[PDB]
UniProtKB/Swiss-Prot annotation:
Keyword Nucleotide-binding (UniProt): no
Functional note: Monomeric heme protein which primary function is to store oxygen and facilitate its diffusion within muscle tissues. Reversibly binds oxygen through a pentacoordinated heme iron and enables its timely and efficient release as needed during periods of heightened demand. Depending on the oxidative conditions of tissues and cells, and in addition to its ability to bind oxygen, it also has a nitrite reductase activity whereby it regulates the production of bioactive nitric oxide.
Assembly mode: Monomeric.
Modified residues (Phosphoserine): 3
Official protein name in the record: Myoglobin
């Protein structure tokens, strides 16, 4: 459970991210595919992308990034009361996409790195601490649902 102060640190930096959702979406995903290429195999629609240039030019990847960050944003804004939002997400990711928890840890790493680079003034040690805590909360609850749904993760 995060404190009200910790949530504020999270939503404060997120308000900046929302000024350019598409741009942040691309940076985060490209960072992920470059740092952990195996994740690219989960996308039968992006597995063909070879270079960072091709990725930055993909309109579909950009739209996916927006869809992803929008869903994450709605969750964070619930400040822990994200039960309703998580169920449908856990079902598709556990039964259809089959995304293991390890991959959620990898993207969490990408989110932090991108925020740290683009928003240094609003992403200090305390702010990163809160963001990490929020993402771990997300991962903890998703992994729980996974078990309930019959997927080890
Ligand atoms: C920060 C956590 C993430 C959030 C909030 C998120 C959100 C979403 C949403 C809302 C969709 C579309 C609706 C749906 O299928 O449920 C989606 C699709 C998808 N996600 Fe996630 N996702 C996350 C992380 C990941 C990761 C780490 C992977 C893979 C390494 C992944 C792989 C996919 C795939 C394969 C699709 C289907 C895309 C397509 O084929 O059109 N997601 N995700």
């Amino acid at each position: 459970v995060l404190s009200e102060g910790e949530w504020q640190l999270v939503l404060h930096v997120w308000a900046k991210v929302e000024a350019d959702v598409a741009g942040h979406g691309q940076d985060i995903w490209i960072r992920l595919f470059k740092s952990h290429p195996e994740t690219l195999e989960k996308f039968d629609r992006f597995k063909h992308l070879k270079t960072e240039a091709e990725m930055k030019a993909s309109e579909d990847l950009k739209k996916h990034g927006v869809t992803v960050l929008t869903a994450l944003g709605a969750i964070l804004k619930k400040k822990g009361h994200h039960e309703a939002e998580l169920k449908p997400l856990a079902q598709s990711h556990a039964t259809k996409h089959k995304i293991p928890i390890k991959y959620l840890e990898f993207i969490s790493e990408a989110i932090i790195h991108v925020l740290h680079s683009r928003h240094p003034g609003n992403f200090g040690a305390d702010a990163q601490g809160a963001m990490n805590k929020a993402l771990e909360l997300f991962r903890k609850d998703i992994a729980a649902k996974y078990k309930e749904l019959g997927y080890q993760g």
